[PDB]
Structure 1
Amino acid sequence: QISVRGLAGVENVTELKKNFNRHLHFTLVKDRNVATPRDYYFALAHTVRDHLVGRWIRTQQHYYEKDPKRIYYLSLEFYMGRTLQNTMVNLALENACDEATYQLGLDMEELEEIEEDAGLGNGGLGRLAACFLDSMATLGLAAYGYGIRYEFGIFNQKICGGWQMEEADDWLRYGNPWEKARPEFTLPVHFYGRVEHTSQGAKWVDTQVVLAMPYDTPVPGYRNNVVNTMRLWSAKAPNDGYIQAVLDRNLAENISRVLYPNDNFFEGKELRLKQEYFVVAATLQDIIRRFKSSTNFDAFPDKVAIQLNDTHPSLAIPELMRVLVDLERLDWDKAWEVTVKTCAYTNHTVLPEALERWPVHLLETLLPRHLQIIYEINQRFLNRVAAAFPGDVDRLRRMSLVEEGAVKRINMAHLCIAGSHAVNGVARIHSEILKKTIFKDFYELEPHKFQNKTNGITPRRWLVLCNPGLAEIIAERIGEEYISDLDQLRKLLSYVDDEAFIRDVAKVKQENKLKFAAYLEREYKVHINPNSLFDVQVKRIHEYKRQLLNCLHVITLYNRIKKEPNKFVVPRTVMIGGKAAPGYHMAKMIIKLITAIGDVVNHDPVVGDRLRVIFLENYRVSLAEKVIPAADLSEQISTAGTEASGTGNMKFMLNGALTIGTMDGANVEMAEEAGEENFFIFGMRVEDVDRLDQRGYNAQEYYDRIPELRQIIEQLSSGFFSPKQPDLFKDIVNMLMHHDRFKVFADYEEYVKCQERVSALYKNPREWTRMVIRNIATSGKFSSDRTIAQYAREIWGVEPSRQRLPA
């Protein structure tokens, strides 16, 4: 149908059709008479998977022969989503599979909806790992993603009576055609035990063993025949009254059972610590095995890079030391030199409650040798600080890896900085804040260590796959090369006054909105006006992300309508979606508030179709691919200095939405690229937040001076949005009035005013679309290909390559 989806050649279509039928018969053991749409999905999945295999085997043997430096990306999260369409796109099979399935009497889009998301992540950090895997394969790097194969990923979110309900994400129920179990490569991981000192060093003895079984998933590059590996570990009990002993195997296998869904507050839970060590210990054995199959560990950093995605795999640092010192018998200083040159650490937040600080007593019991190594790292590190800053005793206590107090803790971020040659933030403003605030002491000691690597998203999934209509109209003008070189989108600026292109951009958006409006009715029975402004905020529910500020605007619009009903206002569909961490009470209250506002707003006859408030249930990668192409306005309204980067912001920019946002995270660089005149910027900057903190933030002041804000707070308190439980939202009101860390009231006035400027522009479709074109055209910097190329050159010491491998 469309050009960017590849060729539908007679020979390939014929071939796909027969392999589809072969799988339906031999693989699924079904005939056409009893086959369901799910059976047809699996037959297609296996057919497409066949095309990966040859390339997968030859890529991996190519690495064995040529022995390039290997990149190991360690993460507890890989938020992969669906694999079928992505595979077709990267292999140039989409039009051929569409044609083949059409000829068999099937709709491929319907078959695509059957696949479960691989939801092995919480949000941005997990999705970043997924985009990075795609870019690393596309750039021809010898890269491996290492993580945990959770049996249950992020919970499915049900909304019952306006409240979030969690249910198990049983994503493996019908099987996973993409993975290959490798039980032959199972490795032992040790826990507990004790440390024995002998003539020849320390020995870790009397341990309990858990087996780590790898499952490999192919990661195809974009049309370069490169297929890399994501290896995820599954926990297995070793084979050595009777009935109970067998049933107790579950205890060991619980390690890989479920993803921890708390993304707001660090809890030192033992099972989580086991998960973190499990991935680290199994992965490092793999790394060393592969290195030895190339005695001398001087070349180790020349052949290995380990990237730590946050501090979650930080135990890699003392584990590498343990292996080099205890097992390989290297002296401490040499082992440390190797470790530092091998490891690099990425930080994703400055919020203190989201930083890992493990109680010493847990590490003492679970990993006694690792604690000894950490103490030794700390002593040697603090000797360097003391020599650099003589007599500065407070610096010594501030920089210590060991935190004293009620309970002693290890600061995993401090461990990571000490043991890494590079530390990066994820957007320019974020990396600056790190140097000026929480890691200031470390920056003063080792300035060379600190870098910025602004985040990005893959334009394969986040344009070509989810928005083929926009990809096509772009390709008509400038060709197809931009898909792996997103900077080429700048060429679109010469079409900003092109009447045909303006109309096409606006047409693609309208089609996306109609399609999403139809999805909503079919799947959830909710009716929206497709001519309204699609006002979208989708992301995990957090106080810092300020879904509450959005809520206040929505109520303001409602109250204004009720005051002057016969006055014209630009119609809006306000959509808010995202999951809340199960133990995050305030986030769960915010979801309830959103639905409660909807219950009042959506049923007021005076409002009509001029304002609709919808909570988007079960927000996940597959839903993002649907809603983002349909959005007109992207809400990126975190308190300045709190959102390290954001990546959803970039997805919306690439897909033709305009952005309303604070000068926070990557928003700053986005506005810089597009021009501030083409962005809806409002609110306090970081410096204004700082000035307000020094003075003391008093929410009462805003309540007293803004009548419209007062009315909303009174409405909340009095039970206007909860008639049968008048005090339902008292926690929210109390927080806003007395202990709001994120200064919602302080940005209210400027936010509302900025929103009026948005409505004013939307009234002029031609100028709206021209501003959209200016955004899409300057979104090139935010490709994860750019991000990964910078990691490769500036941290890993390897050169990217767009050169194709033989098919």
Structure 2
Amino acid sequence: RKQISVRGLAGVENVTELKKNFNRHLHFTLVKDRNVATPRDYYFALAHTVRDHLVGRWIRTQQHYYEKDPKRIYYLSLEFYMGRTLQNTMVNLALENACDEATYQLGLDMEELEEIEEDAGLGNGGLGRLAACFLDSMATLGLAAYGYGIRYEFGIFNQKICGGWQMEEADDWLRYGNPWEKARPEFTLPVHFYGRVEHTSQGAKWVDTQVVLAMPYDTPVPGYRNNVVNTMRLWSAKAPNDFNLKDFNVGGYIQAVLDRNLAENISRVLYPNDNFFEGKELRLKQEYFVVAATLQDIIRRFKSSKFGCRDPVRTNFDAFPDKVAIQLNDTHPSLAIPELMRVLVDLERLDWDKAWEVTVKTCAYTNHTVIPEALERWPVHLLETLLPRHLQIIYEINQRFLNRVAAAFPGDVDRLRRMSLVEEGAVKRINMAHLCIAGSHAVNGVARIHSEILKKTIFKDFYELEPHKFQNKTNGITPRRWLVLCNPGLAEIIAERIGEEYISDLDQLRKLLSYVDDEAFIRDVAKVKQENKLKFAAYLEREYKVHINPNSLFDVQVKRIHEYKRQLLNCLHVITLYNRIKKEPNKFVVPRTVMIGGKAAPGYHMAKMIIKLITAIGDVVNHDPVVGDRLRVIFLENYRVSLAEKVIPAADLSEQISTAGTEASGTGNMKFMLNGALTIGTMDGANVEMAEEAGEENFFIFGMRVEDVDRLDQRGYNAQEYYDRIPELRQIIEQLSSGFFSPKQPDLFKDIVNMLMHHDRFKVFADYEEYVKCQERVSALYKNPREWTRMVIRNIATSGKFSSDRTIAQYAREIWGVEPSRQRLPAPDEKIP
């Protein structure tokens, strides 16, 4: 904690320049004086000074792509889980140490001020943090890339526990302002809703629509020390001045204005589910909105290219795929496909068949899950009302698609019903995943098991029609935030031995294999990890008044609360540990702090019941005198990016416990591998490529492989068989059944026990025995320090592959068709032209 790592150069002219501009923004921007200013005021004076060092290059990077006019990548996501922006901008700009100096000289602690920034919580979990780490890597690799999303007013709710229950409240992240965005009202666009389609003369024209306006807000995304600053464009909904008021017949003037926030409700709140599908109208309107305005912004800056110079016997949209690439993050932007067809056929007047070749060559889709409840099936009755031309375009696309399928698989009548984008049943629906494979030229999974499972199970039919479309790109994590930024010490001690070229070339970590038997490296790695555990132990006791023993194994499961991720199996393990020492008190066991955190989506009653169980286990366990400090269970309240940055560097053991076949990739598992945690995990998602990368000896794999899960499903999963055969498991069911964990509330956990017993979709009891055996094996190693740290050096040295720079260099190469670069653009500036 003496600090001073290579957070860059703290050099004289710059620290001078900085203190000076901090003191100018406090006075001139904040209109605050040295005697009235609080730590929030000073956080902003610094946020504003650091934003200043970035505008030069943002301007330079934007006029630069204009000039050299590359192929542009538009990554469409409904979520961007950015976390906080000050420190990361200082890391990518080389300003961390200069600003630490400058601030200590003004008498302030930088770390005090960085805690003042609220998180940009515009995401739910993995899919949104993926988008965020892709942004960082696209600018670090010099790509002309733009993230396009919604600027939600309220991000993911802030989780609160009251009596061990989750209490949700609004995330008013913008209460205090945002020093990082630049509102752009100049560039507002209209999005159309509802309406009629008239078929008049040569064309459909969508007529009688309500107009909402999409007002943009751009945030800079700086690549790591390469002077590229790209743009995240987030749309906000604005009601028009005329119809939100103007049309003549009494209703009410004041009312007509009060009803504007109704159009403005489209960007008010993030829909809060990880892996579930919400069939609500407001969600489809968010999805059309972001697609609508983004495609306008894409066509505009394509027409301004060398067509708005030579429209080459009219603007030839033929080069549209060679100038545009749009990545659909999940099916949430899938309306991009009938909308690019709507603008091209209806407005730009190309042939259906020309527009279709163009749409397919520019669109590509990333699939993020296999579980059927997460998939989007939008009821035809609401695409008909709200978007009646896009339904016609989708019925037409369906038609032409299945005409291909019939010609390829002639006579095969069940094929055709299975492939259809239009699903019959009572509610006739539209399968959006089907629309994206049909209309994209590449479809990909986020981990090699996941990509094989799509080819083999879920989109088998589609693989047999167009095998070449299906690809894989295993996920990644950005080493800048997820190593340099959250773990300045680990990055430091690596930097001493192998240099710094690895923050943008993480494969170089393999060079650390050579230090596995070097006692200097083995004590420094063990030292960083104790420093981080002591810092988190102290955060806990100050910010949250809990007190934990820093000398125990820090056992942590942090991710959204869902049944397939199996916090229940980990709770079953904690109660085994509790009971093995209550029957044999004076038996020594390796001590551990079990920390579980994550948010439940608000009406998912099972996940909300899981958080009540965990707090109930901690109520018992943490106050048993026979237990002592040997075991404490801790629920980790309001988990999100800033909390992940402090708890992942302090973990010894990482829980990655999903039923094989259910977690498509996972990325918390990589964040933890980077930071000196060992993984206990099933062979699911990217855990399989991580154990292959580090070797299975250096990993703690247990449980059913996918084969084993299918064998059991053919057979029939019967959870009673496990109740019968394992007395310890028997014992826990009756502790839950008979009120041990809910004394004055005894029947309380009756539906988690019932679900386990009769309705376990994720067959928790089946991996239990082999999981408590694998847990005996990690405590064996922990009590042998030097040998835990060598297995740790083996995981950190093998993290390479899992950087998002690799994942994006593969998207670029094999899907977008751009070559990454790392040549620092010659910014900043001084100048004006």
Alignment partner of 1:395 out of 415, 421, 435: 415
Contact kept in structure 2, 1:264 and 1:584, CA below 8 Å: no
Contact kept in structure 1, 2:81 and 2:128, CA below 8 Å: yes
Deviation at 1:406, TM superposition (A): 1.0
Deviation at 1:471, TM superposition (A): 0.2
| 2:789 is the counterpart of 1:787 | no
Contact kept in structure 2, 1:423 and 1:449, CA below 8 Å: yes
Alignment partner of 2:478 out of 429, 434, 458: 458
Measure, in 2, the Cα distance between the counterparts of 1:178 and 1:604. Answer: 48
Measure, in 1, the Cα distance between the counterparts of 2:549 and 2:276. Answer: 39
Deviation at 1:369, TM superposition (A): 0.1
Deviation at 1:797, TM superposition (A): 0.3
Structure 1 residues 728-743: aligned runs within 5 Å: 728-743=748-763
Measure, in 2, the Cα distance between the counterparts of 1:509 and 1:217. Answer: 34
Deviation at 1:200, TM superposition (A): 1.4
Deviation at 1:267, TM superposition (A): 2.2
Deviation at 1:265, TM superposition (A): 2.3
Deviation at 1:229, TM superposition (A): 0.0
Once the two structures are superposed, what CA deviation does each residue of 1:589-636 show, in whole Å capped at 9, x if it has no partner? 000000000000000000000000000000000000000000000000
Contact kept in structure 2, 1:264 and 1:581, CA below 8 Å: no
Contact kept in structure 1, 2:613 and 2:749, CA below 8 Å: yes
Once the two structures are superposed, what CA deviation does each residue of 1:56-113 show, in whole Å capped at 9, x if it has no partner? 0000000000000000000000000000000000000000000000000000000000
Measure, in 2, the Cα distance between the counterparts of 1:179 and 1:327. Answer: 32
Measure, in 1, the Cα distance between the counterparts of 2:665 and 2:416. Answer: 31
Quote the residue 1:181 is aligned against: 183
Deviation at 1:575, TM superposition (A): 0.2
Once the two structures are superposed, what CA deviation does each residue of 1:534-579 show, in whole Å capped at 9, x if it has no partner? 0000000000000000000000000000010000000000000000
Quote the residue 2:212 is aligned against: 210
Measure, in 2, the Cα distance between the counterparts of 1:798 and 1:602. Answer: 55
Once the two structures are superposed, what CA deviation does each residue of 1:224-268 show, in whole Å capped at 9, x if it has no partner? 000000000000000011000000001100000000002232121
Matched residue of 2:173: which SS? coil
Quote the residue 2:289 is aligned against: 278
Measure, in 1, the Cα distance between the counterparts of 2:277 and 2:135. Answer: 27
Contact kept in structure 2, 1:136 and 1:788, CA below 8 Å: yes
Deviation at 1:730, TM superposition (A): 0.4
Could you tell me the TM-score, scaled by structure 1's length? Answer: 1.00
Deviation at 1:4, TM superposition (A): 1.9
Gaps of 5+ in 1: none
| 2:272 is the counterpart of 1:258 | no
| 2:385 is the counterpart of 1:365 | yes
Quote the residue 1:564 is aligned against: 584
Once the two structures are superposed, what CA deviation does each residue of 1:667-713 show, in whole Å capped at 9, x if it has no partner? 00000000000000000000000000000000000000000000000
> Identity over aligned residues, as a percent?
100
Contact kept in structure 2, 1:321 and 1:339, CA below 8 Å: yes
Contact kept in structure 2, 1:140 and 1:801, CA below 8 Å: yes
Once the two structures are superposed, what CA deviation does each residue of 1:41-67 show, in whole Å capped at 9, x if it has no partner? 000000000000000000000000000
Measure, in 2, the Cα distance between the counterparts of 1:44 and 1:447. Answer: 52
Contact kept in structure 2, 1:55 and 1:226, CA below 8 Å: yes
Alignment partner of 1:112 out of 111, 114, 139: 114
Deviation at 1:155, TM superposition (A): 0.2
Deviation at 1:382, TM superposition (A): 0.2
Contact kept in structure 2, 1:424 and 1:431, CA below 8 Å: yes
Matched residue of 1:381: which SS? helix
Deviation at 1:325, TM superposition (A): 0.1
| 2:331 is the counterpart of 1:311 | yes
Contact kept in structure 1, 2:522 and 2:790, CA below 8 Å: yes
Contact kept in structure 2, 1:262 and 1:583, CA below 8 Å: no
Once the two structures are superposed, what CA deviation does each residue of 1:733-778 show, in whole Å capped at 9, x if it has no partner? 0000001000000000000000000000001000000000000000
Matched residue of 2:37: which SS? coil
Matched residue of 1:251: which SS? coil
Measure, in 1, the Cα distance between the counterparts of 2:825 and 2:327. Answer: 26
Contact kept in structure 1, 2:5 and 2:489, CA below 8 Å: no
Measure, in 2, the Cα distance between the counterparts of 1:307 and 1:4. Answer: 35
Measure, in 1, the Cα distance between the counterparts of 2:141 and 2:274. Answer: 31
Contact kept in structure 2, 1:301 and 1:341, CA below 8 Å: yes
Quote the residue 2:312 is aligned against: none
Deviation at 1:128, TM superposition (A): 0.1
Contact kept in structure 1, 2:142 and 2:223, CA below 8 Å: yes
Measure, in 2, the Cα distance between the counterparts of 1:201 and 1:257. Answer: 35
Measure, in 1, the Cα distance between the counterparts of 2:276 and 2:231. Answer: 32
Once the two structures are superposed, what CA deviation does each residue of 1:300-333 show, in whole Å capped at 9, x if it has no partner? 0000000000000000000000000000000000
Contact kept in structure 1, 2:5 and 2:488, CA below 8 Å: no
Q: Which stretch shows the higher mean deviation, 413-422 or 258-267?
A: 258-267
Structure 1 residues 763-778: aligned runs within 5 Å: 763-778=783-798
Measure, in 1, the Cα distance between the counterparts of 2:665 and 2:175. Answer: 35
Quote the residue 2:300 is aligned against: 289
Quote the residue 1:510 is aligned against: 530
| 2:363 is the counterpart of 1:356 | no
Measure, in 2, the Cα distance between the counterparts of 1:4 and 1:341. Answer: 44
Contact kept in structure 2, 1:69 and 1:305, CA below 8 Å: yes
Once the two structures are superposed, what CA deviation does each residue of 1:328-367 show, in whole Å capped at 9, x if it has no partner? 0000000000000000000000000000000000000000
Deviation at 1:3, TM superposition (A): 3.8
Measure, in 2, the Cα distance between the counterparts of 1:433 and 1:588. Answer: 30
Measure, in 2, the Cα distance between the counterparts of 1:390 and 1:36. Answer: 74
Gaps of 5+ in 2: 243-251, 306-314, 828-833
Matched residue of 1:2: which SS? coil
Contact kept in structure 1, 2:88 and 2:481, CA below 8 Å: yes
Matched residue of 1:548: which SS? helix
Deviation at 1:2, TM superposition (A): 2.8
Once the two structures are superposed, what CA deviation does each residue of 1:178-214 show, in whole Å capped at 9, x if it has no partner? 0000000000000000100011110000000000000
Measure, in 1, the Cα distance between the counterparts of 2:462 and 2:637. Answer: 43
Measure, in 1, the Cα distance between the counterparts of 2:24 and 2:4. Answer: 28
Matched residue of 1:515: which SS? helix
Contact kept in structure 2, 1:562 and 1:607, CA below 8 Å: yes
Measure, in 1, the Cα distance between the counterparts of 2:403 and 2:85. Answer: 50
Contact kept in structure 2, 1:156 and 1:169, CA below 8 Å: yes
